[PDB]
Design a protein around this ligand. Structure first.
Ligand SMILES: *[C@@H]1O[C@H](CO)[C@@H](O)[C@H](O)[C@H]1NC(C)=O
Ligand SMILES: *[C@@H]1O[C@H](CO)[C@@H](O)[C@H](O)[C@H]1NC(C)=O
Ligand SMILES: *[C@@H]1O[C@H](CO)[C@@H](O)[C@H](O)[C@H]1NC(C)=O
Ligand SMILES: *[C@@H]1O[C@H](CO)[C@@H](O)[C@H](O)[C@H]1NC(C)=O
Ligand SMILES: *[C@@H]1O[C@H](CO)[C@@H](O)[C@H](O)[C@H]1NC(C)=O
Ligand SMILES: *[C@@H]1O[C@H](CO)[C@@H](O)[C@H](O)[C@H]1NC(C)=O
Ligand SMILES: *[C@@H]1O[C@H](CO)[C@@H](O)[C@H](O)[C@H]1NC(C)=O
Ligand SMILES: *[C@@H]1O[C@H](CO)[C@@H](O)[C@H](O)[C@H]1NC(C)=O
Ligand SMILES: *[C@@H]1O[C@H](CO)[C@@H](O)[C@H](O)[C@H]1NC(C)=O
Lengths: 50, 50, 162, 287
């Protein structure tokens, strides 16, 4: 069935892609926000958070 | 002021943990380091062991 | 005593961004399972429960990923047991209101939180009693169960009538 | 100390083809029923890999100082345990930190110092008249060393010092890598019944030891052990025997690999992306 499988597969990869978005740095020095908070003080790491 | 019949979402429920545990080893096991204290001879001050 | 050979060793420390490889911490604290706790197993700061898994890890690995690529499996370095990681906070809260000029009491519904109080299929519903009788429903809840204000009179939860 | 060899008739090196070889675990996590793609140094499939011979029946002994690229693949179909170990370094003249990975009959040591390496280090095995066993006597690998820091001793693996001329029964693979000065060793023993043209089977490689030296490596050389029986005069000039052995040396390249994981957690198949259009289609669709 093609009509009943694309509505599930496209949703499955869309939710899978959302998890993959958290693994990207978006040009910053780290992906997870807890790492840059531990390595740098919040006054200077504010631009990395934003 | 008026709320009609139906479902509504107000906030979110978060279960905050109350305890934290850290366990790096199973038991303390020091590495061999006796050569910097007990040795046949040492170095001088112009070129000291690092 | 004033001109004797003295072996001077200097033990300096460095202040820079890196995980503490050399440290003197507690070797083993108490082990707690089946509760949402926080752990630091050399690679993460994760808050979740530690269930007893049934999958055996190869004797060279430390972590464990899934299809969604999330750290949901860790190996305890104490005596080599495999513990799963599952978050304890799921979904949010919800409020059931009968409406204006009808009632004042309301019922609280939890989305995906496991527990007067009725354990429904769609989470936890509190403040509303459960009745085995089935009528037509007006306020949807989910999974074939609704809520309504019927006969004093209180808020009841029941399977909807088709 | 070391001695020099005498010129003789040798054999030119041969070139063979790899068949789904050189796949190892690139990370220390557990993966089950997933198809994860990673960027790491692997051996490309159906790549052109060098072949070196070590069989006596003639007098083949060719161990050049091959350059060390970004990761090497070393496969040996060892049967009589002729090969012993490997060395590493840049100039091998007691100026930089060289490596001695030698698997002796009693224990395995990892010594990384500035040993004075000769032009042909080797281990000599002598045959006693009274004792019907082979023991190693000529330990001619270096001359001396000045200073160094790192040292390691591995598990005492047992070696058989007897060499034969029969068919091979075991296959050993080794992968050596150096990223950020961090040494990586991957190995796995796999039995097989073949003499050449390695089978198309799949076997992932699990590491044994993980060593943080922190130096640079640009060259490497392998160590082979010969036998001194009653047939040979016993001089390392023109008369010697080496049994029957064959080892393959391959260089790793930066390639993206799609790894298949089962419910147990091991690697079953691998798909490349820069080898075949069908493989690229398989690895881009993640299926
Ligand atoms: C860690 O130490 C405990 C207590 O001695 C022991 O039971 C356990 O097997 C050890 N784990 C290792 C060596 O991996
Ligand atoms: C090393 O030297 C110190 C001081 O002389 C001595 O107390 C100690 O017993 C020696 N040995 C070791 C293993 O520390
Ligand atoms: C909710 O928790 C209780 C006790 O912790 C347990 O008995 C019950 O099985 C849980 N519900 C589900 C659906 O697992
Ligand atoms: C509804 O009736 C059934 C009939 O067997 C009974 O099992 C169930 O407990 C009743 N539910 C309530 C809430 O009384
Ligand atoms: C490997 O290279 C040699 C010469 O460089 C060539 O003769 C041989 O055909 C090559 N093998 C393959 C499989 O391309
Ligand atoms: C085996 O060779 C290693 C390499 O240096 C050496 O340290 C060890 O002593 C040797 N074993 C014996 C029994 O001589
Ligand atoms: C001797 O060891 C030190 C480290 O303790 C190293 O920096 C130095 O380069 C070594 N000597 C030589 C000649 O390499
Ligand atoms: C090792 O060699 C590389 C390339 O020749 C060089 O970039 C690096 O600085 C060297 N490291 C040391 C410690 O000599
Ligand atoms: C992996 O799973 C299969 C399927 O049940 C089983 O036969 C096999 O024994 C498992 N292997 C291990 C190491 O548990």
């Amino acid at each position: 069935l093609g009509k009943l499988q694309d509505v599930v597969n496209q949703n499955a990869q869309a939710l899978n892609t959302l998890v993959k978005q958290l693994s990207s740095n978006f040009g910053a020095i780290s992906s997870v926000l807890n790492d840059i908070l531990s390595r740098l003080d919040p006054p200077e790491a504010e631009v990395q958070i934003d | 002021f008026t709320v009609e019949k139906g479902i509504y979402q107000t906030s979110n429920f978060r279960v905050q943990p109350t305890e934290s545990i850290v366990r790096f080893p199973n038991i303390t096991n020091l590495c061999p380091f006796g050569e910097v204290f007990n040795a046949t001879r040492f170095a001088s001050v112009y070129a000291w062991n690092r | 005593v004033g001109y004797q050979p003295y072996r001077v060793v200097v033990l300096s420390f460095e202040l820079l961004h890196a995980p503490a490889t050399v440290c003197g911490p507690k070797k083993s604290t108490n082990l707690v399972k089946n509760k949402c706790v926080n752990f630091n197993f050399n690679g993460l700061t994760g808050t979740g429960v530690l269930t007893e898994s049934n999958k055996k890890f190869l004797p060279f690995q430390q972590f464990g990923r899934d299809i969604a690529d999330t750290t949901d499996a860790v190996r305890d370095p104490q005596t080599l047991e495999i513990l799963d990681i599952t978050p304890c906070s799921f979904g949010g809260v919800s409020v059931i209101t009968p409406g204006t000029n009808t009632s004042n009491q309301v019922a609280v519904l939890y989305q995906d939180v496991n527990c007067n109080v009725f354990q429904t299929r769609a989470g936890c519903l509190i403040g509303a009693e459960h009745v085995n009788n089935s009528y037509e429903c007006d306020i949807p809840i989910g999974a074939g169960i609704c809520a309504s204000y019927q006969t004093s009179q209180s808020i009841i939860a029941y399977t909807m009538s088709l | 100390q070391c001695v020099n060899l005498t010129t003789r008739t040798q054999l030119p090196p041969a070139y063979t083809n790899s068949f789904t070889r050189g796949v190892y675990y690139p990370d220390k996590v557990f993966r089950s029923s997933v198809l994860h793609s990673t960027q790491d140094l692997f051996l490309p499939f159906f790549s052109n890999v060098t072949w070196f011979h070590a069989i006596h029946v003639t007098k083949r002994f060719d161990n050049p100082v091959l350059p060390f690229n970004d990761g090497v693949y070393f496969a040996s179909t060892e049967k009589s345990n002729i090969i012993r170990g490997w060395i590493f370094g840049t100039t091998l003249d007691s100026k930089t930190q060289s490596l001695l990975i030698v698997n002796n009959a009693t224990n395995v040591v990892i010594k990384v110092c500035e040993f004075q390496f000769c032009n042909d280090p080797f281990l000599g095995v002598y045959y006693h008249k009274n004792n019907k066993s082979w023991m190693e006597s000529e330990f001619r690998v270096y001359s001396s060393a000045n200073n160094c820091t790192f040292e390691y001793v591995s598990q005492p693996f047992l070696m058989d010092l007897e060499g034969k001329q029969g068919n091979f029964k075991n296959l050993r693979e080794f992968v050596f890598k150096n990223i950020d000065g961090y040494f990586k060793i991957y190995s796995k023993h796999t039995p097989i019944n073949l003499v050449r043209d390695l089978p198309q089977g799949f076997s992932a490689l699990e590491p044994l030891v993980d060593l943080p030296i922190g130096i640079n490596i640009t060259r490497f050389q392998t160590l082979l052990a010969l036998h001194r029986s009653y047939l040979t005069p016993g001089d390392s000039s023109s008369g010697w025997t080496a049994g029957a052995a064959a080892y393959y040396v391959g260089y790793l390249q930066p390639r993206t690999f799609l790894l298949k994981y089962n419910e147990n957690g091991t690697i079953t198949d691998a798909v490349d992306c820069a080898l075949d259009p069908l493989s690229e289609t398989k690895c881009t669709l993640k299926s």
